[PDB]
Amino acid sequence: SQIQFTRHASDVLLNLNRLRSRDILTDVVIVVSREQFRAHKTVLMACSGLFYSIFTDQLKRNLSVINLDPEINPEGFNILLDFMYTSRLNLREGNIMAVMATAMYLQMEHVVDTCRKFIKAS
Amino acid sequence: SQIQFTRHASDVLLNLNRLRSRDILTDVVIVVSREQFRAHKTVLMACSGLFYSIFTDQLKRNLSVINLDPEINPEGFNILLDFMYTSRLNLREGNIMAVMATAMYLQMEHVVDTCRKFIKAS
Numbered sequence: 093s094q095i096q097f098t099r100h101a102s103d104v105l106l107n108l109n110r111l112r113s114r115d116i117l118t119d120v121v122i123v124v125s126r127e128q129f130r131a132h133k134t135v136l137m138a139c140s141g142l143f144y145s146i147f148t149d150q151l152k153r154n155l156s157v158i159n160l161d162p163e164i165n166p167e168g169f170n171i172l173l174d175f176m177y178t179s180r181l182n183l184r185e186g187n188i189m190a191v192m193a194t195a196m197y198l199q200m201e202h203v204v205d206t207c208r209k210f211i212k213a214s
Numbered sequence: 215s216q217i218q219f220t221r222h223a224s225d226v227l228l229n230l231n232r233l234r235s236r237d238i239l240t241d242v243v244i245v246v247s248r249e250q251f252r253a254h255k256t257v258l259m260a261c262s263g264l265f266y267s268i269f270t271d272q273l274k275r276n277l278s279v280i281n282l283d284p285e286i287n288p289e290g291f292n293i294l295l296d297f298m299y300t301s302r303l304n305l306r307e308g309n310i311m312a313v314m315a316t317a318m319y320l321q322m323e324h325v326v327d328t329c330r331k332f333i334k335a336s
């Protein structure tokens with residue numbers, strides 16, 4: 093029927109991360125407290141429920157700058173933004189709470205589910 | 215060190231395909247002979263060498279419409295565009311030549327490599 097390429101999706105995500113690193117077609121700036129993070133709107137919607145809900149709306153779709161709440165941990169958002177482009181989540185006892193709280197706000201249910209499994213096993 | 219999410223990259227590609235289907239943040243129109251195809255510039259660069267070379271250039275980065283050569287097979291490009299968002303390539307004896315020639319023009323080396331293996335086995 094159709095030939096399946098097992099490592100194609102991982103190769104696409106790696107190339108999207110290379111474009112983000114080189115600032116190619118990054119159409120949004122995420123402001124967390126005092127820290128700024130440039131990313132692709134499409135990647136944000138695909139991994140986050142909050143970013144999907146914001147960018148589907150035509151009033152917020154063309155927004156160049158998205159200002160998140162100052163209560164949101166900058167290191168927590170950075171770990172989650174890195175995870176979106178690499179599929180690797182840096183979860184440790186020193187950041188577990190900061191990552192879990194940020195994943196709840198960004199509406200990343202599967203990340204919250206793994207954060208639930210992390211402190212259950214540790 | 216870092217927790218690996220094996221199906222994250224496939225879930226991202228599936229969501230990007232859902233956005234393409236719903237015309238959310240599709241910033242380019244690809245014109246093949248008389249057929250039109252809307253896609254994301256970032257997805258094109260990630261899977262194609264030709265689209266990477268075009269959109270890295272600042273003179274062609276903001277181009278809303280990309281006109282390919284009329285010699286390019288519309289069904290051949292459609293199969294390859296579908297593959298970019300699904301990781302599934304529809305290669306059969308009736309389209310093998312049309313897909314191989316289009317993959318060469320779009321500079322998709324791994325697709326050309328699988329097209330090489332297809333007629334070698336059939």
Ligand SMILES: CNC(=O)COc1cc2cc(Nc3nc(N4C[C@H](C)C[C@H](C)C4)ncc3Cl)ccc2n(C)c1=O
Binds near residue numbers: 138140141
């Ligand atoms: C480890 N991975 C994660 O944690 C990812 O978690 C999440 C990702 C996530 C993505 C989106 N984005 C889209 N959602 C749809 N659809 C919605 C589905 C419920 C139904 C489907 C038809 C369309 N389409 C296109 C996008 Cl871009 C919406 C909500 C999301 N939520 C709530 C998540 O928890």
Ligand SMILES: CNC(=O)COc1cc2cc(Nc3nc(N4C[C@H](C)C[C@H](C)C4)ncc3Cl)ccc2n(C)c1=O
Binds near residue numbers: 097100262321
């Ligand atoms: C089944 N899959 C395929 O057929 C995909 O095939 C191809 C994909 C492809 C992608 C790009 N795009 C980028 N290439 C880099 N780098 C280049 C690498 C050679 C070195 C690396 C550091 C950066 N970065 C960011 C993008 Cl978006 C360039 C050329 C490409 N060519 C020649 C392909 O044949």
